Write a protein that binds this ligand. Sequence first.
Ligand code: NAG
Ligand code: NAG
Ligand code: NAG
Ligand code: NAG
Lengths: 217, 447, 469, 220
Amino acid sequence: DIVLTQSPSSLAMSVGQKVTMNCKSSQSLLNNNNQKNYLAWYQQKPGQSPKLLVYFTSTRESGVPDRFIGSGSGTDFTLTISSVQAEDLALYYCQQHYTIPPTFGGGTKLEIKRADAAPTVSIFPPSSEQLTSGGASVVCFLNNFYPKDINVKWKIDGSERQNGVLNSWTDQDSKDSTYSMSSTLTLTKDEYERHNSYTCEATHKTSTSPIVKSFNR
Amino acid sequence: TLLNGVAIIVGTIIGSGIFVTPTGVLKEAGSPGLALVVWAACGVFSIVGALCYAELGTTISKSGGDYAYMLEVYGSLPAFLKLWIELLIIRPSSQYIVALVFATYLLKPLFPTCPVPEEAAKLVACLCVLLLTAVNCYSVKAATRVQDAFAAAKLLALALIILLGFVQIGKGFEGTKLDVGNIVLALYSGLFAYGGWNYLNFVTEEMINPYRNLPLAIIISLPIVTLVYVLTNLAYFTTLSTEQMLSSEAVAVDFGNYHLGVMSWIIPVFVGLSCFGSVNGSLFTSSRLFFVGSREGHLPSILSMIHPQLLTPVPSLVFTCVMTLLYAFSKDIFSVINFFSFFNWLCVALAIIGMIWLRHRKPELERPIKVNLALPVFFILACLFLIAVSFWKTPVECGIGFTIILSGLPVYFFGVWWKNKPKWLLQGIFSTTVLCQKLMQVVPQET
Amino acid sequence: TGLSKEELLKVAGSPGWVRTRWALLLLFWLGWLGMLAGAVVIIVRAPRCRELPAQKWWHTGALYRIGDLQAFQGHGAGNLAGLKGRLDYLSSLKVKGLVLGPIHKNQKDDVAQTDLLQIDPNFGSKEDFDSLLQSAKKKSIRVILDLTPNYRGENSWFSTQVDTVATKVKDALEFWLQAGVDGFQVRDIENLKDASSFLAEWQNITKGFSEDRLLIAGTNSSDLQQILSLLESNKDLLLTSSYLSDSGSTGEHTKSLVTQYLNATGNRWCSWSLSQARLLTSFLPAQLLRLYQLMLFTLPGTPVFSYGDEIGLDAAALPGQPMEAPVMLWDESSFPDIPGAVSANMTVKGQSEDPGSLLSLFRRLSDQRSKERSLLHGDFHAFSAGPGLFSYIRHWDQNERFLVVLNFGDVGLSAGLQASDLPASASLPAKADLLLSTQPGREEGSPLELERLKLEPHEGLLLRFPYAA
Amino acid sequence: EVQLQQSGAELVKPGASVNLSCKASGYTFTNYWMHWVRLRPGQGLEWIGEIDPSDSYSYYSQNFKGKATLTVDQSSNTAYLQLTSLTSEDSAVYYCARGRQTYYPWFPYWGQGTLVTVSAAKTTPPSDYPLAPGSAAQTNSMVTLGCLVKGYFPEPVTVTWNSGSLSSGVHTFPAVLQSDLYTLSSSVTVPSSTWPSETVTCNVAHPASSTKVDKKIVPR
Ligand SMILES: *[C@@H]1O[C@H](CO)[C@@H](O)[C@H](O)[C@H]1NC(C)=O
Ligand SMILES: *[C@@H]1O[C@H](CO)[C@@H](O)[C@H](O)[C@H]1NC(C)=O
Ligand SMILES: *[C@@H]1O[C@H](CO)[C@@H](O)[C@H](O)[C@H]1NC(C)=O
Ligand SMILES: *[C@@H]1O[C@H](CO)[C@@H](O)[C@H](O)[C@H]1NC(C)=O
C-alpha cells in the first residue's frame, strides 16, 4: 500500500496567523492521464466525526470556509489555513485517494496559543449520598487557564497526599482556547472521618505563589 | 553389396522416436524454421558419432556393446558403472518412452481434442511392456517373428506421412527462441530419434566385408535418415500450426485426422505397431548384456540363467521389465527424454574420450579403421557442451540420476571388489540364488 | 556356478514348486487382466472431449474496415492495385477479414445513374479488383465488399422508391459472389424501409450461395431493443451498431452494456464494435483505447475495427481532415499538408518498432484471439472481482483458461482480486501467468498472486492459467 | 440532508463477534457504496472495506480480509459490519462513511462513530454524585457546580446540564479508568442569582446500559 507521512505532529499557533500542514506520500498521486492529484484533508474536531475539507488536492467541499487552501503536487502536499480562528483546533488527516483501499496520515494536532491566564479554582466537599457507600470522593476543579502545564497539591490536616490522586485535563475549549482540569482524591468513609481540614492548592506558571481552596467538615 | 547394407542400417536407425520428438524440438526451438535446422544438426552429430563407433566397433571388437570396450579402456569400477548406468538408466528409460508413445497414440482417437488421461496412458504403457515381456519369455521362436513383421510398419507410417505432405504441397520460420539452454534441450529431443547407432552399427560388418565400406554405409545412410526426418517435419509444418503441434501428445494423429477421414484405422495403427515393434526389439536384444556382464564377473550369477525347456533368459527379462515399469513413477515424456539423453551422451563421452586416450596409450594397435583426429576433438567437446549446459538447465533429473550412479559404489564393493569372505553371507547368497532357480526353473548356459 | 541343470531336473518335486509355479503364472495373467480391466475402467469413466463447433472464417479473428481506399493510401496511389500492395501489413495484424467501403459507380442522390455492379473507375477496373481479390485469397484475408447504394450522398438508401434500390442489391449480391467476394456489408439500415425483410432476403441469397459467406449489417442505433429486433428474424447476421458507443466516458457502463447484451441475445455470435463506421477514437478518450482493445479482442464474437484503430488514429489530432475518412499515418511523410505536425509515435512505422506501442498491443492480441481455442470459441463468465473491474474468464473444455481484468474506474486497486461467487466449474487459481498488461513495468510471463495483485487506474490484464479436473 | 447514523457503543467479550450497524437516509441507497473506517486511539484512521448495496459485493483491506464481513439490507437502507475474533487491540471507534462518486474513496458523509470496547469486565451502570460549593459559596458573583460520575462501564457516558439548556460554560473532563471501571466529572458555572433560585441538573446518560438520571444540585 501507499504510506502517508505527515508533519509536524503538533502545530501550536496563535489566532489570526497563517499555518501549514505537510503530507508526504510514498508514491506519486498524480494521475498522468488526467493532470490532477488525488489527495484529501479531513478536520476532526474533538468529540466529532471526520469532516472533509478538500479533495483532489485543492477542491474545497461545500460548507467549507475559504481560509482552507490546499496545494502541492506529486508527493509534497500542503493544507494551509490563511488566518487561524479559535474554532480551528482539531486533528487534521491527509488521505490519498489514488488507490482503494485508501490510507491516511497519523494527523497534525493544531493547538492555539493565547495570553496566559490563571485558573479559577474550586473545591467540592463529598456528596452526602456518596457517604452511604462506605467511600467518599473529594473533587477540585481548575477552570479556564493557559497554558496546559499545571500541578496540584492535596493537603489533609496539613499532611501532603500522593496516594489515590487522579487528574484529567479537558481538550482546549474552541470558544476561548483555555484548558480546564479536574483533580480527584478518593477515600474510605473512615479515612474521610478521621481528618477534619481538606486543601487543594494549584501551582500554575502565571503566579509565584500557589492558588488555594479548602474546607473543614 | 553396399546398397543392401544401407537398407539394413537405415531401417535400424529410424526408430520410433520420430513420433514423439517433433513436439519436443518445436517446444524448445519455438518456431518451425529452427526446428528443421535442429533436425539437420542432429543428423550431422549422428554422422560424426557413427564413424567414431565404426572405429571402436572394429578395433576392440569384443561382443556385448560399450561395456565390452570399457573392460579394455578402464576395467574395474568404470566398467561396472557403465553396466549399472545402462541397466538402471538407459535401457529402462528408452523402453518406457517408447512404451508410453505407444500408449498415447493407441488411446488418442478416443480423446481427439482434450489430452488423453495420464492415469490411463501409464497403464496402457505397462500392459504393453508386460505383454511383450511374457512373449519374449515364452518363445524366441515367436518373438523373432514379432520383430520381423513390424519393422515394415515403422517405415510404412513414416513414408505415408511424407507422401501426404507432398500432396498437401501439390494442392498448396523465424526461430523465436535462441537461448543456448533451450537449444541443448532441442538437440536432446532431436538426437533421441537417431539413438540406434551406438548399440548395433557393427552388425553391418558381418555382411559388408571391406573395412573401408563400413564408413561408406554410414556416410550414405545417415543423410538418408536426416532427409526422412526433415521431410516428416515439413509434412507436419505444411499441415499444422505451431499452436496445434505443441498441444498434442501424439502429433501424427492430428495430421492423420486432418487428411484421411478413415484416420482411426491408419496413423494410430501403423505408428502404434511400430512402437510395439520397438519395445519388443529392446527386450529381445537385451540378454546379450546380461550374459556378457555375468561371464566377465560384474553381474550376479542368476541373471545369466535360462529356462531349459524354452531356451529363453527368464531372470534377465524379468529384471529388464521391472526396471522399465518403475519409470511409470516419472512425470512427463519429455522429462524422461531429457533424463535418458543426459546419461546416454555422458556414456558416449566416456567412450570417445576413451578412444583418444587409447590411441595415445597404445599406438598402432592394428586398427582396420582409423578416423582423422579432427572428428573426435570436435565430437568430445559436443558431448561435453550438451552435458555442461544440462547440469544447470535441468538440475533435478541429473541429481536423481547421479544418486543412482553413486548408489552403484556400495554394490561394486560388496559384489565385486571387496569379495566379502563370511561363510554365512555366501550361504545366504547361495540360498537366495537357488530359491530363484527353483521358483523360475532356470539353469546356467553352456560355458 | 550355482545349482546346475543336472541337479535341478530332480529338485522340482510336484507337491511344492511345480504347483507353486503354476499358481504364480496364473497370478501374473490374472493381475495383468486386472490391470487391463483397470485401464479400461479409467478410459470409460474419464470425461469425453466436447466436440468443436464448426467455425466459419469470421469466427477465427478480427475483421477490418476500409471506408475510403484513398484516405488509407494518400492520393494517386488511391486505387485497388495500391491496396494489393498493403496486404502484408494486414497479414501482420492477423486480420482474418477486410471490408472495402463501396466501390460501385454511385452518382450522388441519383437513383438511375447509380449502379451497384459496375465499379467507380477512380478505384481501378474489375481486372484490378480480381487481381487484389486473388492476392487476398492467396494471403488468407477474406474480402467483403460494402454495397450500401448512395454512399457519396446524405441518405445511403435514397429517399424514394426503395423496392427498386433493394432490387439493385438483390441482383448485385449474385454478381459479386460469382466474382468471388466473401460477403457483404450494408449500412445505415435504420434509413431502409422494411429493413428486417430485405436483410432476410439478402441473407437467404448469400447463404443459399455458400455457407462460408456473410452479410454484416450495420445501424446507427444504440437501442438494445431495436438491435434485438433486427437480430430476431436473422440469426447468422453480424450486426454492428453504436450500442457499446455510449460508454460513460470513463468506461463505467461497459461491464453492464456488455453483459446485458450477451444475456439478451442468449450468448449467440456477436460482432463487437464501437460503431458501424467511425474509429474507436471517435468515442473513446485516449486512456481507454488500450483497455478497449484488450476487451474487444476477448469477448465472445468477431471484433470489428476501422482502419487505424490499431494505431489509435484520431481525426482531430491533424486538423481539417474529415471525421468520415482520416488519412492513415504510415510514416512521418503521410500528412504533408501541414509538414512537421506528424510525430513518429503517431505512425505505423513509428509504432512497429516499439513493444510498448498501441500497434504492438494490437498485433499481440490479434495473435491470441486467432490461435487460442479458448478465445476462439470458449464460454464467457463475468464475475465481481473488485470495485471498478470488469472481469471475466474465457474457457473451453480442458484447454488453457484466460481471465481478463479490466480496471475501468480511475482509481487503482491495492488489495487483489477478491472474487465473490465464481461458477464452480470455473474457479480462479491461487496464481496465474500474466500474458500481457495494458501497462508497461510488468513482469510479463511471470505468475501473479491474485489475492495480492495491484491494478493501476485503467490497467487491464490478460492472465492465462491451466485447467483443473 | 444526507445522514448516516449508528449505535453509540458496543461491548465485546474477547474472541466474540459483533455487529455494528449504519442506517442511511436522505439518498437513493443503492446508488452509492458504503465504506467502514476505524480509528484506533492515538494511531490514525484505517479503512476496512466497502460494500455495494445494489448486489452485496464487498471489497476489503488486506488487514481485514476474513476478519470482517459486510452485508446490507436494502429494505431499510441499513449496512452492517460484522467483525470477528476481536482482541483488546481491536477496541476502537468504527465509522460508517459514504462516498461522493459511486464507490470512489473520499468521504464527505460520516456517521457518528460506534465505540467498540473489547473487555471481559461486565457492563456496570453509573453512580452519579452532585457537587455543591459548601462554605462561602455566594461570596462570589459566579458559582461553579459539578457532577461526579463514578465506577461506570463501558467508556461512553454523556452529560448535559438542564436537558441541554445550559450548553454555555460547561466543561466535562475525560474519563479515568480504575480497576476496570471508569470515573468522569462534569462542571458548569452560573450566576450567583441563578443556582439557589432555579433547577440545576446533570442529565447523565449511558447508551450501553440504558440508564438516564437527572440529579438536582441541592445546597448543603
Ligand atoms: C431461405 O433459406 C431457408 C434455408 O436456409 C429456407 O428454408 C427458406 O425456404 C428460404 N426462403 C427463400 C425465399 O429463399
Ligand atoms: C440515426 O438515424 C436516425 C434517422 O435518420 C436519426 O434520427 C438519428 O438522429 C441518427 N442518430 C445518430 C447517432 O446518427
Ligand atoms: C438475464 O440474466 C438474468 C440473470 O439472473 C436471468 O435471470 C434472465 O433470465 C436473463 N434474461 C433476460 C431476458 O432477462
Ligand atoms: C508522441 O510524442 C509527442 C512528442 O514527444 C508527445 O507530445 C505525445 O504525447 C506522444 N503521444 C502521442 C499519441 O502523440
